Subunit: 113 residues, 2 copies
């Protein structure tokens, strides 16, 4: 049940006043992600939609840091013999990787300031 235009347009409508990292922004983003269970593709689409390119680049720097840290430490179901988490979260039969990526996404967005 990937989001259509209407869902994302709403999300941006109520994430317009607040700034990234503020309680409202993170509240809405976490709700949307926990509801639709989106993969990395839809997450990157949502980020490109919401904020400027500078904020997206900052978020991706933080996300690369978090993902590198986690892969060094070890992920429950991460098998690097097929592709990065980045690509392992697109396969629908890898729910654990997808949820881990969503959580790193939300953390990296919350730690921008």
């Amino acid at each position: 049940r990937p989001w259509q235009m209407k869902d994302l347009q709403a999300i941006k409508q109520e994430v317009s006043q607040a700034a990234p990292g503020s309680p409202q922004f993170m509240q809405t983003i976490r709700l949307a992600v926990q509801q639709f269970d989106p993969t990395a593709k839809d997450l990157q689409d949502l980020l490109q939609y919401l904020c400027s390119s500078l904020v997206a680049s900052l978020h991706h720097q933080q996300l690369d840091s978090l993902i590198s840290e986690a892969e060094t430490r070890g992920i429950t179901g991460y098998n690097p013999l097929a592709g990065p988490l980045r690509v392992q979260a697109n396969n629908p039969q890898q729910q654990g990787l997808r949820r881990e990526y969503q959580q790193l996404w939300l953390a990296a967005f919350a730690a921008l300031p």
Copy 2:
């Protein structure tokens, strides 16, 4: 699953204030193009709805130049013996041409200001 009247109305209303090629307009138009997966015909309809004949003509010229360079170089899926890229992009079995058309379209429209 082509867009409907409500989607177009929302797309136009959300970006009424902004100017063509502004980061906001680029965000919303790029999201629409990447989400609905339309051909050239639907893109022409969308442009006619959004901007006037002047902006339509300027985008038409810019896209003509961009398509010119792109398919004069030679593209993986383009075979010039069957028809112009505007017609190949309208055949649902040539998704590579469709995606190239979408990207040339968005870049051309972004190159206005």
